Each structure stands twice: as C-alpha cells, then as structure tokens.
C-alpha cells in the first residue's frame, strides 16, 4: 500500500524566479568539425531543442575543446562532413579537429531556428591566444552579441594536471596566468567579448580565487557536476542516483557564496549522471529522467541561472541521440527535461513534505507560473514505494496531471510523458487527461514507485 505523505504549498514562501533560458544542453566542440550538425538544415535537432524550451542555452566545450583548431582557411575533412561527436570518454587524447567559417556560419542559423543562446569554448588547453582571439572575433561577427552569452577559456582546467594538457604541477595560479593571456588577446580583437569561468570539473577551491581575480572580466561563474563520484567509489547504480548527493550540496553552496562575495550569478554549464560518456544500465534509463528533472528543480531552487546537460552522438547519457543522416530521437533523460519545459518559468514556492520518512526520495517543487497558475513537479524517486500525496495550500476548482512513466526504472525505452512518447523532430503533445482527485485545499495524488508527475491547477 502507498506511503501517505503530506505536501503543504505556501504561496507566501517565495523562492527564486526561474529564468526563461534556464534549460540547456552541452556538446563536444569536436562536433563543430561537421558543418551539417549545428545547421539551419538540421530541422530535426532544432525541433528537439525547441521542445525543451523556447529559450535555452547551447554550450559547446568539453574535453574536445582542447583538440579543436579554428582556422579561417580551414576546410572540413570528408569524414568531418559525417562526424557525430559523442561525449568524450576521457580514456586518451581526443582526435584533432579543425573548425571552419562554414561551421560557425551554420551555427548562427541553427541558433536562429532554435531561439537559443550560445556559450562557446575556446582552446586554452592547446591553442594559442592569437588563434583564440581570431576565433572569438569570427564568432562575435557571425553569431552576434545578443546570441553569444559567453566564451569560456578552457574546459575543466582543474583536470589539466592529470590529463596531459598541462604538467602535474599545474594549479590555479598557473591557470590564472593563462586565462589573463587569452583574455587580453581576445579583448584586443573583440572589446565587448563576454566571458564565463572557470568551467571547472570539480575543484571548489578554484571558485573563490577565480571570481575574486576576474570578477570584473566575467559575466557569470560556471562549473560542472556529475552525480558519479571519484573513480575509487563503488560503481554508480540507479539506487545511488536517486539519493541526495552531499557533494552537489557543497558545490552549490560554494557557488552561492561566490555570488554573495562578488555579485556574479552561476550556471551549471556541463552536467550528467555518470562520466566517461555514461554508464550503460544507469545513464541511458528512465531513472535518468527522474534524476535530471529533479536536478533541474533542485538547482533552480538554489538560485542557479541554468543548466546544460552534456550529450551528443549516441552517448549513454545524451538527452537527444542521432545524426543528420539517420535522424534524431529523444532518449529517456530528455523526458525529465520535457517535464520542466512543460511546467515553464515562474517563481518557486514553499512545498514542504511531511510524514515522508518511509518514502524519503520523493521530491516536490511548487511554482507560480508566469501565467499566474500554480504548478507542482513531483519526482517519486523511491524505487520500491508508491505514494499518496495529500496536497494542501492550493485553492483551485480543477487540477490536471501529466505523468512521467516507464514500466521499470532501468528501462532504456518505453518512456512517456502525458501518455505519449516524443516523436520525430521533438514533436510532443499529451494524449492522456487525468484530473487530480479531491478539491480545493485538499487534493490527493497517487504516484507509483519510480515515476514523476506535473500538476497544473486552473
């Protein structure tokens, strides 16, 4: 029988306001070697992005950003015209790639088709300041100030000391000197170039020193998050993925403190469940939908300006999989992002759970929509417990529910939202209508184990 929990919504308990460009995706820079991928001709992928949000941010970076070499006279290889660059697996050095004017031109058209903004990595790991300045100038020329949100100078510079990009002694002080050299060169070509950083993988010690040094030179602070811990941890499981992550909480507190010290907001510019491209049986499953949707809300509630789920190719954790030649599909994680998209923007409200110790991985978020209607996003991440949620603090004549479902937490397919899969080119509309039982001030929602729900009140 279900665990009977209470949820009290408090319309006076005002949280953060979710911005319209919160959602986003991250891709490997190597993908820019193929001018057909981020292209106005890529209508399938553009549709998948639009379904994730009418505003949002595309970030391009990752390990391959140290292996991409812009040149104004470059041409893609024949193989480049067909490249599908999935998440770098981190086992050895990435292949060298060139980036061309054509690809940047086509990226511009892709951003126009999607309505999304751009965070663009520059090659601080192996490239030169002058080449970065030239690349930045072309990007600014072509993409424009309104769509270019920030350049980033290197990806995960806190890992250069161990991945061959720099010697073992590389540290924040060394990075700060590299950053300044690149910044100076770029600003000579592009005096209005916007920056974010430090784009770190994990090392929270770099946040303070970076922000204090470069606070007048950046628009926002960026860092990364993977749910999987260090290599010496036990292998990630779905059970672990559903549970709170104290490292996340600490990282988020570090970022909040930077904002308190400097005024700079923060964005989680690369995230996913498990590293090395993901873990088959965890990252590519329905549990990842629950994980991702919940993470989006947790971070929004903490004051993040947005998020960018890493992906590409057919990587285990990619939200969207596919290629221009074979087409694109929504993977399970996409459906958690879709729940967020459908909820929309607005101000988060207090949403306190009680009587929930037997269903501790249920999370709930309440929102006053931009349209004035109350929504509640719930993630029943308990893998073995169904819940019955008694909802107080909401007065409405009618509420509806859209369910986020799969038959098993580990399913790699069979994921639906609102009773429907996402179709080709991101097409989605709900096919199952359900009213929330109960009435004004006392609604009652059942949720099966390992499921999610979006409630909308009239």
| Binding-site ranges for ligand GUX (CB under 6 A) | 62-63, 87-88, 90, 155-156, 159, 201-202, 230, 270, 275-277, 310
Q: How far is the CB of 63 from ligand GUX (least distance, A)?
A: 4
With CB under 5 to 8 Å by kind, the binding choice for 214 among Cl ion, ligand GUX, none is none
What is the nearest approach in angstroms of Cl ion to the Cβ of residue 7? 21
d(CA 307, CA 312): 16
Sheet strands (E) in 74-219? 97-99, 117-122, 148-153, 195-200
- Judged by CB, which is closer to ligand GUX: 226, or 297? 226
- Say which entry of ligand GUX, Cl ion, none residue 230 contacts (CB below 5 to 8 A, set by partner kind): ligand GUX
The residue with its CB nearest to Cl ion is 303
Q: Could you tell which of ligand GUX, Cl ion, none binds residue 90, using a CB distance below 5 to 8 A set by kind? A: ligand GUX
Interaction partner, residue 56 (Cl ion, ligand GUX, none; CB < 5-8 Å by kind): none
In the complex, least distance from residue 228 CB atom to ligand GUX, rounded to whole angstroms: 8
68 binds, among Cl ion, ligand GUX, none (CB under 5 to 8 A by kind): none
> Residue 145 CA to chain centroid, in angstroms?
22
Residue among 377, 368, 306, 429 at smallest CA distance from 20: 306
Give just the sign of the alpha carbon dihedral 406, 361, 333, 302. positive
Residue 311 binds which one of ligand GUX, Cl ion, none, with CB within 5 to 8 A depending on kind? none
**Smallest gap, in angstroms, from Cβ of residue 132 to ligand GUX?**
18
Helix (H, G, I), strand (E, B) or coil at 189: helix
Contact partner at residue 421 from ligand GUX, Cl ion, none, CB < 5 to 8 Å by partner kind: none
Tokens read off for 248 = 């996340």
- The residue sitting closest to ligand GUX, measured at its beta carbon, is 62
Q: Which is nearer to Cl ion, 105 or 257 (CB)?
A: 257
CA atoms within 13 A on the CB side of 408: 8
Q: Which among ligand GUX, Cl ion, none contacts residue 322 (Cβ within 5 to 8 A by kind)? A: none
> Is 90 or 419 the residue whose CB approaches ligand GUX more closely?
90
Dig out the tokens for 431 from the structure.
Answer: 């096919």
CB of 308 to ligand GUX, least distance (A): 11
- Positions touching Cl ion (CB under 5 A) are 303
Contact 322, 315 (CB under 8 A): no
Which of 191/231 has CB closer to ligand GUX? 231
Q: Which is nearer to ligand GUX, 62 or 127 (CB)?
A: 62
282/316 Cα distance (integer angstroms): 9
For the bound state, the minimum distance from the C-beta of residue 47 to ligand GUX, rounded and expressed in Å, comes to 25
Neighbours of 290 (CB within 10 A): 30
**31 versus 252: smaller Cβ distance to Cl ion:** 252
Residue 281 binding target from Cl ion, ligand GUX, none, CB below 5 to 8 Å by type: none
Minimum distance from CB of 204 to ligand GUX (Å)?
Answer: 11
Map 239-281 to HEC letters: HHHCCCCHHHHHHHHHHHHHHHHHCCCEEEEEEECCCCCCCCC
Closest CB to ligand GUX among residues 127, 399: 127
Give the Cβ contact number of residue 221 at 10 Å. 26
b/e string for 125-150 if b means 16 or more Cβ within 10 A?
bbbebebbbbbbbbbbebbeeebbbb
Cβ-proximal residues to 180 (8 Å cutoff; 6+ apart), any chain: none
Q: Which is nearer to Cl ion, 303 or 369 (CB)?
A: 303
> Which residue number, 268 or 320, has a Cβ lying nearer to Cl ion?
268
Smallest gap, in angstroms, from Cβ of residue 443 to Cl ion?
Answer: 28
Task: Give the total residue count for the chain.
Answer: 458
Q: Write the DSSP string, 333-387.
A: HHHHHHHHHHH-SEEEEEEEEES-TTSTTEEEEEEEETTS-EEEEEEE--SS--E
SS3 assignment, position 53? coil
What's the min distance (Å) between Cβ of 15 and Cl ion? 8
């Amino acid at each position: 029988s279900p665990v009977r929990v209470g949820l009290s919504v408090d319309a006076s308990a005002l949280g953060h306001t979710i911005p319209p460009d919160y959602t986003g995706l991250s891709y490997e820079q190597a993908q820019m070697a193929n001018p057909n991928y981020f292209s106005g001709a890529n209508t399938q992928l553009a549709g998948f992005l639009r379904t994730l949000g009418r505003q949002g941010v595309l970030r391009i970076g990752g390990n391959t950003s140290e292996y991409t070499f812009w040149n104004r006279h470059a041409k893609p290889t024949a193989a480049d015209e067909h490249l599908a660059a999935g998440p770098d697996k981190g086992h050895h050095a990435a292949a060298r790639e060139v980036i061309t004017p054509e690809a940047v031109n086509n990226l511009s058209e892709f951003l126009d088709k999607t309505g999304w903004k751009l965070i663009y990595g520059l090659n601080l790991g192996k490239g030169t300041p002058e080449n970065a300045a030239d690349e930045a100038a072309y990007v600014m020329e072509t993409i424009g100030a309104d769509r270019l949100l920030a350049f980033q100078l290197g990806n995960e510079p806190d890992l250069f000391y161990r991945n061959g990009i720099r010697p073992a002694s590389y540290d924040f002080a060394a990075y700060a000197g590299d950053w300044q050299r690149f910044f100076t060169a770029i600003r000579k070509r592009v005096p209005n170039a916007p920056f974010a950083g430090p784009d770190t993988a994990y090392n929270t010690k770099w946040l303070v020193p970076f922000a204090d040094k470069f606070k007048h030179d950046v628009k926002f602070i960026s860092s990364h998050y993977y749910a999987e811990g260090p290599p010496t941890d036990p292998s990630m499981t779905i059970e672990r993925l559903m549970k709170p992550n104290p490292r996340l909480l600490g990282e988020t507190a570090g970022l909040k403190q930077v904002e308190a010290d400097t005024g700079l907001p923060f964005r989680l510019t690369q995230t996913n469940s498990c590293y090395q491209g993901g873990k088959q049986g965890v990252s590519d499953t329905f549990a990842a939908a629950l994980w991702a949707g919940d993470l989006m809300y947790q971070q929004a509630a903490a004051g993040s300006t947005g998020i960018n789920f890493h992906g590409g190719g057919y990587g285990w954790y990619t939200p969207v999989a596919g290629t221009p030649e074979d087409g694109f599909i929504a993977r399970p994680e996409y459906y958690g992002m879709l729940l967020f998209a459908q909820a929309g923007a607005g101000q988060l409200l207090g949403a306190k759970l009680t009587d929930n110790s037997a269903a501790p991985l249920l999370t709930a978020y309440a929102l006053r929509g931009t349209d004035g209607r109350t929504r509640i996003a719930l993630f029943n991440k308990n893998l073995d417990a169904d819940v019955e949620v008694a909802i107080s603090g909401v007065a409405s004549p009618s509420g509806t529910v859209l369910r986020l479902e799969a038959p098993r937490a580990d399913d790699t397919t069979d994921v639906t939202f609102g009773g429907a899969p996402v179709g080709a080119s991101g097409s989605w509309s709900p096919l199952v209508q359900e009213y929330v039982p109960g009435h004004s001030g006392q609604f009652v929602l059942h949720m099966r184990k390992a499921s999610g729900a979006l409630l909308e009140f009239a």
